[PDB]
Amino acid sequence: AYTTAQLVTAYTNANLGKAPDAATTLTLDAYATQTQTGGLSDAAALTNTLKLVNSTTAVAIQTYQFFTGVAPSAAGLDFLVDSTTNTNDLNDAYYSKFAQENRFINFSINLATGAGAGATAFAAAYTGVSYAQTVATAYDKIIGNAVATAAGVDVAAAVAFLSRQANIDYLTAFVRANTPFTAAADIDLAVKAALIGTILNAATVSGIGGYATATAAMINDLSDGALSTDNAAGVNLFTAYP
Amino acid sequence: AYTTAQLVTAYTNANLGKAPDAATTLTLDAYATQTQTGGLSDAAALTNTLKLVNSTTAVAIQTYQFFTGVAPSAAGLDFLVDSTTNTNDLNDAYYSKFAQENRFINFSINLATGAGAGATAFAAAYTGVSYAQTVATAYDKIIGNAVATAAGVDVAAAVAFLSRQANIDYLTAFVRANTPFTAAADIDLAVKAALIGTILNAATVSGIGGYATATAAMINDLSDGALSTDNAAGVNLFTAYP
Ligand SMILES: [Ca+2]
Ligand SMILES: [Ca+2]
Ligand SMILES: [Ca+2]
Ligand SMILES: [Ca+2]
Ligand SMILES: [Ca+2]
Ligand SMILES: [Ca+2]
């Protein structure tokens, strides 16, 4: 049985010091009183609280891992998610009109195709490969192929959907309008980045797959105020949370 | 848990020093990260890596064994698969437009009907025997008859399929067009060679049978850089890997 004042601290630390909106406070309060009456277990209530921190936090953990091979340190996360120093950060004014999806896509393009940390590596790895293959291989890296089938979702139908011509056309226009790229190679390269972003979203929303399960456990550890692993130059998800 | 840099060395040695394409690197990378998250066992990941070396390598091991009675030595394999000296080799320019199937057929005709090593022996063994019998006996030699039935595949339906008149007609035209044979006996002889080739393909793609299981174990041994058996004048599969 959690007091509503415990669920707010659990939410605050997950959001790295951003105190929840008036609306969500009411949501948390419901989760509290549903545990006092035994209509909800303890672990269940805490999971739902941390599900609300998806857009703000999970966006920074997951993308950093996929592109740079390592999730950001606690100190680093602070900077990306909720800080005094970064004027524009994930839970700040700049981003208040981006949905969940467009947040993932934003982060991806930043890290991948720019002067971002992942540019040089991602540029060499995904050169001269087709849209179809980009999606198929990435799907398996993130969500697993065996895991998805056991979970009951049909892989083939999903991969086909992501790589259909209509989808690719939509992104091409999107990337051309938004990003300052004009070269034919860089646009091609950025579209792939946006696709992987779309997959990361699709993963974190369903809870299936290796990436999603590890990120969940990192946020759980981050909940109580202190991050146990907290290597100075980044925490590799798959090492730390088996 | 394999690092993606381990799976590439495992692939490279199997391909005898040919470094994988950009596309396949992405495939291997997925297999790595699926072992770090425990959505895939270790042995399973390594098998799938070596499954990718089928077209290049397994083609040289299996055909040599069937026609000359012995798989090529490590030094020999180098020459056939990936070398400086042989301008045209299996993982080189000449063969880049042949599918898996047409590779098997190519190797078979070479070794069997030409001035190839197997010509004299294969010529005496398969003279004055019908298409039906050629297929039936070969099926049993390669895939086993008991083994296939236990595996659940119905033998009778498969053998009939391979020896139907339509199939024979297709090959006759194929052999006439491609190979420099004009005599009525040599064409007949080459068609049989092409049939056995087709069976070798059908074997290595399903994983059933004695030939396929032994070739798999030879490639596994070849994976780590050094071939244990490595007799100078050839390795007999069935002796070395029981
Ligand atoms: Ca803070
Ligand atoms: Ca701020
Ligand atoms: Ca902790
Ligand atoms: Ca070599
Ligand atoms: Ca060569
Ligand atoms: Ca060895």
UniProtKB/Swiss-Prot annotation, chains A, B:
It is found in: Secreted, Cell wall, S-layer. It comes from the Bacteria. The S-layer is a paracrystalline mono-layered assembly of proteins which coats the surface of bacteria. Probably acts as a physical barrier to parasites and lytic enzymes. The calcium binding of this protein may mediate surface attachment by ionic bridging between the S-layer and a specific membrane-associated oligosaccharide. This is S-layer protein. The lineage of its organism: Bacteria, Pseudomonadati, Pseudomonadota, Alphaproteobacteria, Caulobacterales. The gene is rsaA.
